[PDB]
Design a protein around this ligand. Structure first.
Ligand SMILES: Nc1ncnc2c1ncn2[C@@H]1O[C@H](COP(=O)(O)OP(=O)(O)OP(O)(O)=S)[C@@H](O)[C@H]1O
Ligand SMILES: Nc1ncnc2c1ncn2[C@@H]1O[C@H](COP(=O)(O)OP(=O)(O)OP(O)(O)=S)[C@@H](O)[C@H]1O
Ligand SMILES: Nc1ncnc2c1ncn2[C@@H]1O[C@H](COP(=O)(O)OP(=O)(O)O)[C@@H](O)[C@H]1O
Ligand SMILES: [Mg+2]
Ligand SMILES: [Mg+2]
Ligand SMILES: [Mg+2]
Lengths: 456, 228, 114, 228, 228, 114
DNA sequence: CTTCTGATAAAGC
């Protein structure tokens, strides 16, 4: 490895005095998968890698460098490990509902499929038209606004529009005639924006095309917006935030600049967690994709690289083919296959290699295998290795806390290494189980645990 | 069948009374809490296994968050003993086992840091889901005659000490092999005899069969059978 | 008179029907085990110790068989004097330099137009 | 390999001085598969073979040879390897929509589950009729023209037909009367083509069968065409 | 092998003077499998076996013998080996579509991708009816005419019936009424045979059972038929 | 009286229930190990060191077993005086030629007329 | 004439 290409975070297990470095360029553009049994030290190994990546500064300046790391925290550990970082829990993070790219907007609001037609187009027509109403730029790019375009629309006018078309009344000439405080108006393309207001009364001889057909649809729509689970995305805080401040929040480019961004998704439900993982994975990927094509036309190199750390990837990217894992898997898989070119790579952390999907986990060209006692997990590590050097996998069950085997394109030979101790460790200390059992029967405060459990 | 969860008693009791009942923190305080689910059907056994495991894990999770606010570690650790784990957490990917498997898997995957760990008992290593046994650092093995099970124990060991699995079929009663970070070297041990043992002693077939034809009182058995 | 040249970093996801129609195969370093299993089964020829040979191929090293070459050979393909545009983001080298200012408005304006 | 059939683009790995040729006729006349991992050298290998392919000329002439290679460059990366070659970007490239067959036309315009079956049929009927009207060959092959057959058709005229069918006014005898500047005509197979004009007015005492149904379908089609 | 049974097409590899005969009867009434790699020589082996089997005669006559060999030549290579033989390419060969069975007719026309049952029933019903019309034999085997039976049917009439069933009309009496030059009839199995003509015009009140769901089925059938 | 001759370059893709109905097997140079292992199981007889024999067969060299032959023998099939020749496009011969102009205009008018 | 009810149907899964 070239001397100016060396990135070390560990030393050899057999000889402590020799440090084992990896090709620092090749370590991060080719995806990292770290696996090992429970309590093996994956979180400390991940934190030690990102700590050395933060302090990896070229000579000639003072201040924080160009590292960009996003950590998905489901156990709230790396707040302590990175004190000068930005932590974004669900109660304080705002991800707007107008940043959905259409496919997830289709899935977020509609729990139905295979039969909704009249409920479908009135949903997409309301959103697409409301984006042109609230658009404040030149009209040349107003016409190119579509359902998947990331422009602000009011969801409360969208519900008002669908609840109005619920109450349609046509006239003997077969067109819907409305009436508002300015006067009666035909329901047409240039007059469809007036249905966004609640105070419209229809005048008609007969019921309209969608009269009484969206009463079930509006109730499902209203009883999803006021979910406090989705208050980070569908709440009132997404109203006053814009596209720009969303990106400064995700990669810590705001008033507090940090190389590490941590998202506290610790005790949230899965449906909140699956929305959080799939949104930010797509948003970071498309930011890296679009910043790449800006740099293509400029023919310049001021690109920023982003690494996303996916701890507990079995929660949101498992091998199982369930539909509740579908939207989260596809966002991470897109980063796994195509994300390497645009500057968005992933750090995959899980406790078995055989539970993460093969379309995601086999795209990782570097590997940090800690202790694995499962015969199916060891066979995965053996088959990633040629049979000449496959005998080093025999030491996997004998690995105690701190050692792992690093293989991949970024390292010369696969070696059992000792990951360097974290002087600023994450908050994942092993509980001294017997020493906490020799004490008194301590009176656990049940009231304090319950009234947080209740709000959680 | 669901009277324990959907009965009239669910109205009266509170959240704090339930948590105190499950870990014996009530008026009668005990180190050991036993859930006697002996004759219940699977559909209410899987409900009991999955809900109590979820409640205890989230109690351990929320206790740690309270302790982390005061810059403290978790005060009370909880160990859950899953006896006869093949009934609710098997290798099979059937949909009936899904809720009970996922609750125990959450404890196995994530309960180490939250103070909720598990002791899992079953006949064979191969009849339990691999997700739970892979996370078990300590692995105690009694006599194992099935060759698939013996090779499963063999791969858990390093190859230098892997020859100790050859005494697995000849293991006597109370003779165990203890592995993991707890023990210095994997070794065959003799578990200390229980002065107060579980009431699961083998019944002497020849001693019982040598006596007279017993009347068996079918009315009392059927009366109990019909209640269950 | 219309023939194919199929280049793919994951040969396993290519359909077996179209991949079988190929007659000359250039096999570079194949680290993915499913890519190894797929290629070795569908290769028209074999070489000695091919299981360890495919991961061990160096950069620009190839294994060529087919009916256009008599002996399956390990070949060091000559370097491109005029190389194609290579996308190799040096994450360490870009992370060592100072925190660069991001033109978010330029990126977002192209993102919103898409 | 014969002396005139040799195509050398590589050299032996163990012996650098030895160059390994392939049968150049046999190499390209049968399909080639270049597989490898990421960064193995596939794109440089593809560039090297094609660079040597265009340099294979007979000594008699100067200028371009008869090699014709088309690259589906998904990463916009082969322009540097072949600077003199023609490159077709999205602004540069021009594919006519009418050369798409029936399945490709449907996937371009129509949507999964977002289109009713009657909305789909008027789309298919308009295109398969517009292909016949803009056909300028002999009329013997007009009857064999279908929706799948690729012939030139005006997609804006297709919009006008669909927009007119959205404004249809049915008569008392379940047919549609249409008024044009030439005159009034009942819609049938013989005069369906006069709906491709924009300036056609419907005459009827009642709303047509497809009236008010394709208005949603018009705006989705116009959104597709005017999308830049 | 008896000398009259001998059939020699090869000689021993190690001794060229030893010609290896096979039992020429037994070689051919039991199936032959010639396997090899590409470029091993199995096309030449097939050609040499058949040239040896064509020029073998009783020598009591002058002329062609009784060999009957059919080659499914997919590479167009055996024309050179047998110049005096009959070669049938796409331009020369005519294969009747009505000798196809039901599975082959489904594979030629239907697609398993869409797998629409409603296209499948009308397709089988049209052909099975049309095979009964064009059948000139005795009535006692007309009732066993099926979709799978190898009898002549008109594919343009089948398309015409299928296109007509896309134009069905539903009346207040829930019968389908059609108008023809011969007369006016109801959609009965006796009267369905006059839907095979294109010159019919439907009469009714509302849309029929199969209205609007066969146009994509007609266009794909018409795409196959008018494909050159 | 309707028998069949199977000539395949990938024997391991043939279904086992059809390939086992054949009695006489003319096994030429088999080179893929999957086709070698498939054929060796369903062959009615065996020969000495058939594993190394099959990829080592020379050009026209074959191996015939079955009811027809007495013993499995390595044979040289007789050379075809009138060989089966396929009209194949010589790419490097055509690509070495000058760039052709007259032919492209003739192809388009043929495509348009039919 | 329009409204409402009820029945038939088709769905996707
Ligand atoms: N290099 C190391 N040297 C010594 N102890 C270490 C080292 N790395 C980690 N540890 C210890 O490992 C313990 C548990 O490690 P963790 O990283 O929390 O386990 P884990 O990998 O997160 O497994 P799960 O599935 O998340 S519980 C910590 O309390 C550390 O003290
Ligand atoms: N014949 C060769 N000799 C030496 N180095 C080579 C050779 N071929 C490729 N390389 C090196 O390989 C690097 C990247 O190779 P590429 O061909 O661009 O990657 P690839 O094989 O196409 O994989 P992807 O998935 O397309 S990034 C180049 O920058 C060269 O340094
Ligand atoms: N019995 C034989 N003796 C000598 N040469 C042969 C023999 N059989 C085939 N060949 C040569 O082998 C080449 C392979 O041709 P072919 O039989 O078409 O291959 P394949 O087995 O792939 O069909 C031919 O060019 C021919 O000259
Ligand atoms: Mg962890
Ligand atoms: Mg490339
Ligand atoms: Mg051949």
């Amino acid at each position: 490895i070239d001397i100016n290409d060396r990135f070390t975070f560990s030393s050899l297990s057999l000889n402590t005095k020799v440090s084992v470095p990896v090709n620092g360029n090749r370590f991060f553009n080719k995806h990292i998968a770290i696996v090992g049994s429970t309590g093996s030290g994956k979180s400390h190994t991940v934190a030690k890698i990102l700590q050395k990546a933060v302090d990896e500064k070229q000579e000639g300046y003072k201040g924080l460098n160009n590292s960009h790391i996003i950590i998905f925290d489901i156990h709230s550990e790396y707040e302590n490990a990175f004190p000068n970082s930005n932590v974004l829990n669900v109660d304080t993070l705002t991800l707007p509902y107008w940043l959905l790219n259409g496919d997830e907007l289709e899935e977020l609001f509609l729990d139905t499929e295979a039969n909704d037609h009249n409920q479908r187009n009135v949903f997409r027509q309301a959103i697409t038209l409301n984006k042109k109403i609230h658009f404040q730029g030149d009209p040349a790019t107003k016409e190119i606004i579509s359902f998947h375009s990331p422009y602000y629309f009011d969801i409360n006018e969208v519900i008002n529009y669908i609840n109005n078309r619920n109450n349609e009344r046509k006239n003997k000439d077969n067109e819907h005639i409305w009436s508002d405080e300015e006067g009666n108006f035909k329901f047409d393309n240039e007059n469809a924006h007036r249905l966004f207001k609640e105070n419209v009364t229809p005048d008609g001889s007969s019921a309209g095309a969608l009269n009484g057909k969206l009463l079930n649809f509006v109730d499902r729509l209203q009883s999803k917006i006021f979910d406090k689970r989705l208050d980070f995305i569908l709440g009132e805080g997404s109203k006053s935030v814009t596209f720009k401040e969303t990106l400064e929040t995700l990669i810590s480019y705001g008033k507090d600049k940090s190389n590490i961004t941590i998202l506290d998704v610790s005790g949230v439900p899965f449906e909140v967690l699956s929305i959080c993982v799939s949104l930010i994975s797509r948003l970071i990927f498309e930011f890296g994709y679009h910043s790449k094509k800006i740099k293509r036309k400029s023919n310049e190199n001021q690109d920023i690289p982003i690494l996303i750390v996916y701890e507990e990837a079995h929660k949101y990217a498992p091998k199982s083919d369930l539909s509740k894992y579908r939207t989260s898997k596809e966002a991470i898989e897109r980063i796994a296959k195509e994300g390497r070119k645009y500057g968005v790579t992933l750090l995959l952390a899980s406790q078995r290699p055989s539970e993460i999907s093969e379309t995601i986990f086999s795209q990782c060209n570097t590997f940090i295998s800690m202790r694995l006692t499962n015969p199916d997990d060891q066979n995965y590590v053996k088959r990633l290795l040629p049979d000449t050097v496959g005998d080093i996998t025999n030491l996997l069950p004998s690995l105690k806390e701190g050692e792992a085997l690093i293989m991949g394109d970024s390292i010369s030979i696969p070696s059992i290494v000792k990951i360097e101790k974290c002087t600023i460790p994450p908050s994942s200390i092993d509980i001294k189980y017997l020493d906490e059992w020799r004490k008194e029967w301590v009176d656990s405060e049940f009231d304090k645990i319950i009234e947080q459990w209740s709000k959680s």
